[PDB]
Amino acid sequence: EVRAAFPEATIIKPSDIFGREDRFLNYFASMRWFGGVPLISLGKETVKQPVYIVDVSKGIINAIKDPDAKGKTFAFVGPNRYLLFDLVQYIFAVAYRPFLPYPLPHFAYRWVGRLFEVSPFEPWTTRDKVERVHMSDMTLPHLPGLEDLGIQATPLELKAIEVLRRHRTYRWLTSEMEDVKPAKTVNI
Amino acid sequence: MFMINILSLIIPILLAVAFLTLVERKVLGYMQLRKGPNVVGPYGLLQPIADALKLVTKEPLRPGTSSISMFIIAPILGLSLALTMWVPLPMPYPLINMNLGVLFMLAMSSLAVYSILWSGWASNSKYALIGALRAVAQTISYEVTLAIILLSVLLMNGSYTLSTLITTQEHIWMIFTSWPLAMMWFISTLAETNRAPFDLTEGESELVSGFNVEYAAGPFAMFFMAEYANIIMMNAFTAILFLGASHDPHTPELYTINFVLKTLALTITFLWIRASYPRFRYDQLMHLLWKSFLPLTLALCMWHISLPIMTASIPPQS
Amino acid sequence: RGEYVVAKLDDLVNWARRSSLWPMTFGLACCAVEMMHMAAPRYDMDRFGVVFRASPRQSDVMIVAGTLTNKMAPALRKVYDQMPEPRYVVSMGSCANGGGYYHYSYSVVRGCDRIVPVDIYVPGCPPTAEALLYGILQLQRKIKREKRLRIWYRR
Amino acid sequence: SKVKQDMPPPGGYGPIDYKRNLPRRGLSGYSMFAVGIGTLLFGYW
Amino acid sequence: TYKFVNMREPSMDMKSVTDRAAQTLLWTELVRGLGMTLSYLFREPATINYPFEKGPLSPRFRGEHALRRYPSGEERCIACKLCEAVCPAQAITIEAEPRADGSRRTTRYDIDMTKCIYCGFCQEACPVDAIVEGPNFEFSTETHEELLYNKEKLLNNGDKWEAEIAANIQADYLYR
Amino acid sequence: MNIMLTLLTNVTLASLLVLIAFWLPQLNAYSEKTSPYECGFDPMGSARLPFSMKFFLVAITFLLFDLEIALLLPLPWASQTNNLKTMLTMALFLLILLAASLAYEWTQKGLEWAE
Numbered sequence: 001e002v003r004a005a006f007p008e009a010t011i012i013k014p015s016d017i018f019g020r021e022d023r024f025l026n027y028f029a030s031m032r033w034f035g036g037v038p039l040i041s042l043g044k045e046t047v048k049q050p051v052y053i054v055d056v057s058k059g060i061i062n063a064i065k066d067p068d069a070k071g072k073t074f075a076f077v078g079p080n081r082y083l084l085f086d087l088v089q090y091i092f093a094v095a096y097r098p099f100l101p102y103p104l105p106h107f108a109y110r111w112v113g114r115l116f117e118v119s120p121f122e123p124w125t126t127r128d129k130v131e132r133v134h135m136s137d138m139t140l141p142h143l144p145g146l147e148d149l150g151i152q153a154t155p156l157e158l159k160a161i162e163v164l165r166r167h168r169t170y171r172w173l174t175s176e177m178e179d180v181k182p183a184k185t186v187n188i
Numbered sequence: 189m190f191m192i193n194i195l196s197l198i199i200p201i202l203l204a205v206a207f208l209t210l211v212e213r214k215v216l217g218y219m220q221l222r223k224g225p226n227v228v229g230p231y232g233l234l235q236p237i238a239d240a241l242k243l244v245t246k247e248p249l250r251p252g253t254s255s256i257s258m259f260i261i262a263p264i265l266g267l268s269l270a271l272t273m274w275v276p277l278p279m280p281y282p283l284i285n286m287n288l289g290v291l292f293m294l295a296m297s298s299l300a301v302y303s304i305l306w307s308g309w310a311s312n313s314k315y316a317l318i319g320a321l322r323a324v325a326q327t328i329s330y331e332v333t334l335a336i337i338l339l340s341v342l343l344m345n346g347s348y349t350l351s352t353l354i355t356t357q358e359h360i361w362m363i364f365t366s367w368p369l370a371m372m373w374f375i376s377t378l379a380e381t382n383r384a385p386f387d388l389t390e391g392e393s394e395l396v397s398g399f400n401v402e403y404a405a406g407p408f409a410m411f412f413m414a415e416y417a418n419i420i421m422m423n424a425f426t427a428i429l430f431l432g433a434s435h436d437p438h439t440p441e442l443y444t445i446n447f448v449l450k451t452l453a454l455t456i457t458f459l460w461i462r463a464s465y466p467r468f469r470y471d472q473l474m475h476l477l478w479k480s481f482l483p484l485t486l487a488l489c490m491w492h493i494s495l496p497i498m499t500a501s502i503p504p505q506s
Numbered sequence: 507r508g509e510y511v512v513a514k515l516d517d518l519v520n521w522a523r524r525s526s527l528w529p530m531t532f533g534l535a536c537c538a539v540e541m542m543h544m545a546a547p548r549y550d551m552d553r554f555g556v557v558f559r560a561s562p563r564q565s566d567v568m569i570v571a572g573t574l575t576n577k578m579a580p581a582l583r584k585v586y587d588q589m590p591e592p593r594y595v596v597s598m599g600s601c602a603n604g605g606g607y608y609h610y611s612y613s614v615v616r617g618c619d620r621i622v623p624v625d626i627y628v629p630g631c632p633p634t635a636e637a638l639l640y641g642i643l644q645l646q647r648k649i650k651r652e653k654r655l656r657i658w659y660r661r
Numbered sequence: 662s663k664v665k666q667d668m669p670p671p672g673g674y675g676p677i678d679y680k681r682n683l684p685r686r687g688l689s690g691y692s693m694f695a696v697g698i699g700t701l702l703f704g705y706w
Numbered sequence: 707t708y709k710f711v712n713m714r715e716p717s718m719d720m721k722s723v724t725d726r727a728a729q730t731l732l733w734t735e736l737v738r739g740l741g742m743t744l745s746y747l748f749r750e751p752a753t754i755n756y757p758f759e760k761g762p763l764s765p766r767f768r769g770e771h772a773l774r775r776y777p778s779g780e781e782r783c784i785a786c787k788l789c790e791a792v793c794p795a796q797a798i799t800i801e802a803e804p805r806a807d808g809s810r811r812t813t814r815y816d817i818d819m820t821k822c823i824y825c826g827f828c829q830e831a832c833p834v835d836a837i838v839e840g841p842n843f844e845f846s847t848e849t850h851e852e853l854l855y856n857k858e859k860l861l862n863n864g865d866k867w868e869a870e871i872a873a874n875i876q877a878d879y880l881y882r
Numbered sequence: 883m884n885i886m887l888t889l890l891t892n893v894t895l896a897s898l899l900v901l902i903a904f905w906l907p908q909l910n911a912y913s914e915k916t917s918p919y920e921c922g923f924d925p926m927g928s929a930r931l932p933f934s935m936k937f938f939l940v941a942i943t944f945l946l947f948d949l950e951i952a953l954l955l956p957l958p959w960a961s962q963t964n965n966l967k968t969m970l971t972m973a974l975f976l977l978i979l980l981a982a983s984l985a986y987e988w989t990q991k992g993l994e995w996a997e
């Protein structure tokens with residue numbers, strides 16, 4: 001609809017965005033409260049390609065300055081794609097909290113999402129949110145990405161402690177980046 | 189209806205703890221050429237409620253380096269003891285009449301320090317550990333005489349029951365017979381509650397806030413009641429201990445009015461002392477008590493055991 | 507209507523905050539000494555509900571009063587970050603309102619706002635102990651006029 | 662006309678106290694102990 | 707000359723020793739303090755309630771600036787830049803221009819109330835009593851931009867507090 | 883019956899107070915807010931390193947002092963005996979010994995702070 005009303009409207013298509021107040025890394029980090037970490041089919045069939053917040057922020061700024069952003073539709077995506085189970089493995093390793101995955105059928109998770117929607121305040125997990133975690137980032141190589149603008153993507157491995165240092169207990173609070181190895185990346 | 193009695197001994201105290209804060213602000217202010225809170229409602233009578241809602245709706249800060257389980261037990265332990273240590277007090281007729289009332293008085297009074305102890309440790313900071321350990325140092329000097337003064341004064345009462353205190357004080361005040369002990373008890377009760385000259389554990393000018401530095405909102409609000417409910421209760425303890433009023437067997441109104449007035453007069457003096465003197469040093473505090481107080485306790489306790497036998501004035505046990 | 511009960515709970519919450527806000531013990535320079543005169547018996551800040559509590563963990567409004575310099579700017583923002591929510595920062599005096607007399611020097615940040623989200627600006631060099639006495643009360647009106655739950659019930 | 666400033670009145674000014682005027686009050690030290698013992702004796706009796 | 711302050715050796719007579727012993731044993735100077743505060747409790751508080759009653763000032767008080775104008779209505783400022791040349795904080799920024807009537811007024815008179823320190827030199831500077839701080843110590847704003855005054859705000863302050871500035875200057879124009 | 887009912891009621895009321903305190907106020911945590919307080923600047927980093935306090939000697943003596951305050955507590959019931967001659971002698975022994983233990987504790991430095 002916006003493209004129809006405003007033909008020369010640059011449309012930015014970010015993937016999952018991670019950062020300090022992202023509700024994506026914090027989502028899995030906060031999952032520790034409710035027992036273990038529930039992933040449907042262990043989350044082994046869902047590949048995600050997150051992108052750091054600042055790069056997309058610089059992407060918008062560069063798009064404004066760029067005289068060629070008129071009409072184009074950019075897809076802002078990160079450098080590497082990670083299977084969701086390995087991504088959660090990376091998150092809980094960086095937070096050093098114990099990982100307790102367990103399978104959960106799709107219909108029952110949808111029921112769980114319904115229960116959490118009841119809260120009249122900021123919901124923690126909706127049925128819609130459960131679906132998003134399952135939605136693997138569709139690859140759109142024809143769509144002009146991020147490097148054409150000029151911004152080089154920052155791998156999530158570098159700037160991951162920013163989000164998750166807070167979630168660490170006092171025990172592993174001063175632990176650095178190199179303590180936890182980079183997670184395996186299913187690449188294109 | 190015993191449950192109705194329990195709330196009738198908790199909620200009326202809680203409002204009494206609340207209004208002590210407003211009274212202290214005004215008493216301190218009027219002893220300062222100031223006026224004190226007088227805009228929140230009439231005469232500032234709405235001020236405690238204004239602070240009441242703010243704190244419980246204040247952001248309750250969780251420090252990351254803090255140990256969470258011990259973080260929350262301390263405010264619970266502080267308040268729980270404060271209320272439950274009101275229950276043996278013989279307000280006309282004590283709610284919980286026990287043959288060992290004062291021993292139970294000391295037990296939870298000694299249990300109270302673990303609030304400032306665990307909270308000081310759990311806060312995980314320099315000022316947290318400084319306040320908690322000086323809280324040990326302040327309270328370590330403190331129980332040794334607190335028991336002795338309690339023992340010496342009560343030795344001519346007859347037993348450890350708090351109800352019989354009134355019968356002993358039926359004719360004259362206890363302070364007439366043990367005023368050297370009463371001054372020394374009063375300083376310690378001023379001291380057990382970490383108040384006025386002995387407030388090293390808090391130490392605003394020297395420890396910012398001491399143990400309370402990393403305690404906000406309700407967890408702070410809870411710490412304030414434990415401190416202030418102990419103020420009223422300890423003064424009430426002193427009022428019965430030394431200034432036991434007359435008790436008509438048929439009208440408990442008479443004792444209740446007199447007893448409450450004595451507690452109010454004593455609690456004002458706590459604010460009176462708090463305004464006037466400067467603050468000690470925790471080394472001098474310990475040196476003041478174990479070098480000057482404690483030697484006097486032993487001889488005074490020596491006097492108060494020899495006196496009943498020499499005068500054939502031992503008190504009845506039953 | 508739910509709007510009525512929300513507004514009634516709205517008025518209850520803020521009235522608690524505006525009548526019990528505690529200015530921190532945060533003084534810097536010449537602008538701080540006369541602020542003591544506000545706390546002095548002449549004006550008696552405490553009568554209006556405030557208490558001068560230290561320990562930013564237990565304070566609401568931050569009285570940035572004095573010249574804000576380079577060497578301390580990290581200390582202030584660490585202090586401001588430690589203050590719980592809600593928190594307000596009243597930039598007090600011309601030094602903290604843009605640099606004051608030393609606006610053009612080399613080790614002063616020109617304005618307290620460049621480090622902190624600065625609330626109502628009270629000017630003066632120094633502002634009279636009464637001049638920001640209104641500054642504190644004028645903030646109490648700002649606390650009065652907030653919506654919070656009104657937005658939440660309409661979010 | 663006449664030069665008028667804030668000059669002090671012709672009689673200068675009243676004498677201003679500056680020396681310490683800390684009053685001394687209270688019973689004699691012997692009396693304080695005497696009355697203190699007196700209450701003790703009455704209390705014992 | 708000089709006066710020794712504290713070396714007063716106490717006497718060792720039995721009366722003096724018992725007095726000190728009574729003082730240490732039966733705390734007296736502590737009670738002297740308590741009696742002092744209690745006496746200072748029943749006084750009259752020095753507080754004044756806010757805006758309903760306000761503190762006392764003097765006619766030469768320094769506060770919010772204002773740009774007055776002649777009895778005819780013409781503005782006093784002939785843009786001599788003296789106030790800018792004496793401004794210790796360099797808050798004054800003015801540019802002049804030959805006005806349509808031919809008179810010599812200023813196009814811009816931005817006073818940055820966040821820089822100047824209320825020295826009052828500006829009121830001493832202009833020989834036409836153009837700029838002068840008003841008695842209004844109260845102009846606190848919620849945003850930083852509001853404090854940055856321009857010529858228009860200065861004239862508005864001149865038109866608002868003109869009754870005070872005429873009276874206050876009338877009182878103190880002889881002392882200076 | 884009554885005593886644990888009183889005990890249970892008090893811990894319950896406290897639990898609710900902290901519960902509404904810790905849940906209601908619409909939290910917002912951003913890491914540096916949870917950072918330790920160090921008087922405006924960063925902590926040097928410790929607070930669990932061994933805080934060597936200097937009143938160690940006076941610390942243990944307090945334990946020994948309390949052990950004998952329990953001994954001299956039964957005096958109110960001890961005075962109601964048929965042998966006050968023996969009871970008075972043994973009672974005064976404890977206070978004499980307690981003073982004696984303190985006197986040695988005092989004279990041989992002891993009570994003094996460690997610097």
Ligand SMILES: COC1=C(OC)C(=O)C(C/C=C(/C)CC/C=C(/C)CC/C=C(\C)CC/C=C(\C)CC/C=C(/C)CC/C=C(\C)CC/C=C(/C)CC/C=C(\C)CC/C=C(\C)CCC=C(C)C)=C(C)C1=O
Nearest residue numbers: 206209212213236239240243392393409531532533545558
């Ligand atoms: C460096 O710079 C500085 C400044 O400037 C920048 C300054 O200006 C000043 C000058 C200002 C001054 C005020 C001078 C003193 C200030 C200092 C910092 C000096 C050091 C201070 C001290 C040594 C003394 C500190 C004393 C204090 C803090 C006073 C404490 C006691 C009080 C009575 C006041 C506080 C009272 C409070 C908070 C109100 C009560 C508390 C509550 C929680 C409210 C009640 C709550 C409830 C009842 C709970 C809810 C329950 C309910 C309603 C019951 C019903 C419901 C149920 C469910 C049961 C200084 C010194 C300075 O150095």
Ligand code: SF4
Nearest residue numbers: 536537599600601631
């Ligand atoms: S604004 Fe003026 S009074 Fe305040 S600190 Fe700066 S120079 Fe001093």
Ligand code: SF4
Nearest residue numbers: 793822823824825828
């Ligand atoms: S009052 Fe002084 S510092 Fe302020 S603008 Fe005028 S001359 Fe400059």
Ligand code: SF4
Nearest residue numbers: 783785786787789832
């Ligand atoms: S305000 Fe005064 S000093 Fe400034 S330009 Fe006008 S006349 Fe000159």
